[PDB]
Amino acid sequence: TKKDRVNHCLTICENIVAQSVRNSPEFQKLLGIAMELFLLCSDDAESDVRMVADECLNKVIKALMDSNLPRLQLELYKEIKKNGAPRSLRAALWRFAELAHLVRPQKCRPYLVNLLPCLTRTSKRPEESVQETLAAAVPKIMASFGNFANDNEIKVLLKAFIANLK
Amino acid sequence: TVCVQQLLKTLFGTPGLYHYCFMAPYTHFTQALADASLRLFEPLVIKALKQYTTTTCVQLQKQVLDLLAQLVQLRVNYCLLDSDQVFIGFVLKQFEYIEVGQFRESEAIIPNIFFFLVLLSYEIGIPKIIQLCDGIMASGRKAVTHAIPALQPIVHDLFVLGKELETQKEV
Amino acid sequence: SSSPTIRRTAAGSAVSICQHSRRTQYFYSWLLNVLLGLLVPVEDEHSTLLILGVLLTLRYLVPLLQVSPSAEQLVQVYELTLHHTQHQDHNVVTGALELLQQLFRTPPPELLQTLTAVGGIGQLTARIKGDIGQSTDDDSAPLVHCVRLLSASFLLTGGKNVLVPDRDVRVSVKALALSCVGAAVALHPESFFSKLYKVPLDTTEYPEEQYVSDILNYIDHGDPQVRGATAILCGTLICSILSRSR
């Protein structure tokens, strides 16, 4: 079913954008379930499957950065705390630094407290590919989530990375 | 909206090295001393207000405070918010994020936040407008970005343009 | 709230406290500031169930208005209703017409001198198809103005002595409009002899212009409380010419 797995991921994408109905109590349940399913298509190891279904997850986000941004960013914080595979956790981390400057400052302070437990585990990970993309997100995340933390939260985070100089 | 800001204007009518080194700069000196001895928009307008509450780029937040200072001069009746006061409640909350500092690019919006507020009061009143500006100065960031561009909309729209108006000029 | 039983029990609770609160006159001026921001400028959407909440607390408090409630606070109450005798409904048209029958019978004495006066409202600031002349104009009292307005919208057509049909305006709505024209003649008797339109209305269409005397052709109109409320419109027109000119 290696060619049967390719056709499954791509038909879920087009029937969300062509709904033209958002913020609905029917439309809220559908976007949570099949959003985690876009990354299992990338988690399966084949370059015909890994290249094809990762460009398809980007069709969903950009057509929904206007309409459903608070629904998009709630399913996505869940996967880092899942602390999954080094291929699954990686390509989700591109998506979350580019939407950091799209949050509102009304909802920002709940998003800061939840990441510092999640941003220390991916500093303790010895996978040399997982450690690379974090040096292209800690530039982008903590510049827009920078000002919202006190002097207590930021002294904990810098004692961890120096133990990654060892 | 820069495409929409303009349509509504025109749908509603609207020398030889002694001169240069000495003799030309020596005589701008002595001349300023003698003077010192002296509605198809209704579908399109409603969509632009849902964007300001939910965006974060502050190049877009600056061109939406000039689209609403033109609907009050050109007297469009205050029916953009037909029942409630949805949009004017959201401008008051943004003053909470600048004083503490929980706002990213307050510099390029604080000259245009305060032009929208004073021009509505001729129809939030000028008692309430000047209590907001006193918070930013003493309790907030430095002056040459926040506090000093905060009063360029007020002073030009209060000193240039009965007994109630006398007490507010002392403040 | 939207229930007719729950709207009239919250209105008689605000007004029974201010008779007994601590300062009976200080708490009358405070309920008039809260309610007119609920109807601050009238050209808005005002949630027409909530328009009926403000006019029922004011039928219970005008009996009690006779820092104080100011003479410029009470003239903001009065222009608020003439816009609301025109705002279409049958539950919102009947709400501002019981409020006007009672403010002429038991008027507050600050409001009562600003309407009989010749300039009137002009010193305080410093179905209808004609130039009536609003309640800001000089050279006429505002009670000369307020009888021209409640007639051509409810119970009179500006061309000829003719009844308005009961299909257009209900005969529960035509009953409260004959009792408001009678309580003002006891206050300002020169209104009943006035012309209906100030600028005359189109002599091409209509042969003759009429005065407000076709109010007194509703003795033949059908039910009680219209022939009985033009029975009472001729009672206080004779009571108040004899006491006006001695």
UniProtKB/Swiss-Prot annotation, chain B:
Tissue specificity remark: Expressed in the brain cortex (at protein level). Widely expressed with the highest level of expression in the brain (nerve fibers, varicosities, and nerve endings). In the brain, the regions where it can be mainly found are the cerebellar cortex, the neocortex, the striatum, and the hippocampal formation.
Top-rank taxon: Eukaryota
Subunit structure, as described in the record: Interacts with PFN1. Interacts through its N-terminus with PRPF40A. Interacts with PQBP1. Interacts with SETD2. Interacts with SH3GLB1. Interacts with SYVN. Interacts with TPR; the interaction is inhibited by forms of Huntingtin with expanded polyglutamine stretch. Interacts with ZDHHC13 (via ANK repeats). Interacts with ZDHHC17 (via ANK repeats). Interacts with F8A1/F8A2/F8A3. Found in a complex with F8A1/F8A2/F8A3, HTT and RAB5A; mediates the recruitment of HTT by RAB5A.
Free-text domain note: The N-terminal Gln-rich and Pro-rich domain has great conformational flexibility and is likely to exist in a fluctuating equilibrium of alpha-helical, random coil, and extended conformations.
Disease: Huntington disease: A neurodegenerative disorder characterized by involuntary movements (chorea), general motor impairment, psychiatric disorders and dementia. Onset of the disease occurs usually in the third or fourth decade of life. Onset and clinical course depend on the degree of poly-Gln repeat expansion, longer expansions resulting in earlier onset and more severe clinical manifestations. Neuropathology of Huntington disease displays a distinctive pattern with loss of neurons, especially in the caudate and putamen. Lopes-Maciel-Rodan syndrome: An autosomal recessive neurodevelopmental disorder characterized by developmental regression in infancy, delayed psychomotor development, severe intellectual disability, and cerebral and cerebellar atrophy. Additional features include swallowing problems, dystonia, bradykinesia, and continuous manual stereotypies without chorea. Some patients manifest seizures.
Protein family according to the UniProt entry: Belongs to the huntingtin family.
Name recorded for this polypeptide: Huntingtin
Species of provenance: Homo sapiens (Human)
Higher taxonomy: Eukaryota, Metazoa, Chordata, Craniata, Vertebrata
Residues represented out of the complete protein: 1309 to 1570 of 3142
From Swiss-Prot, chain C:
Entry comment describing in which tissues the protein is expressed: Expressed in the brain cortex (at protein level). Widely expressed with the highest level of expression in the brain (nerve fibers, varicosities, and nerve endings). In the brain, the regions where it can be mainly found are the cerebellar cortex, the neocortex, the striatum, and the hippocampal formation.
Membership in a protein family: Belongs to the huntingtin family.
Transmembrane segments: none
UniProt protein name: Huntingtin
Domain notes: The N-terminal Gln-rich and Pro-rich domain has great conformational flexibility and is likely to exist in a fluctuating equilibrium of alpha-helical, random coil, and extended conformations.
Lineage: Eukaryota, Metazoa, Chordata, Craniata, Vertebrata
Disease / disorder: Huntington disease: A neurodegenerative disorder characterized by involuntary movements (chorea), general motor impairment, psychiatric disorders and dementia. Onset of the disease occurs usually in the third or fourth decade of life. Onset and clinical course depend on the degree of poly-Gln repeat expansion, longer expansions resulting in earlier onset and more severe clinical manifestations. Neuropathology of Huntington disease displays a distinctive pattern with loss of neurons, especially in the caudate and putamen. Lopes-Maciel-Rodan syndrome: An autosomal recessive neurodevelopmental disorder characterized by developmental regression in infancy, delayed psychomotor development, severe intellectual disability, and cerebral and cerebellar atrophy. Additional features include swallowing problems, dystonia, bradykinesia, and continuous manual stereotypies without chorea. Some patients manifest seizures.
Sequence ranges of the HEAT repeats: 1-23
Species the sequence originates in: Homo sapiens
Span of the entire protein shown here: 261 to 784 of 3142
Disulfide bonding pattern of the chain: none
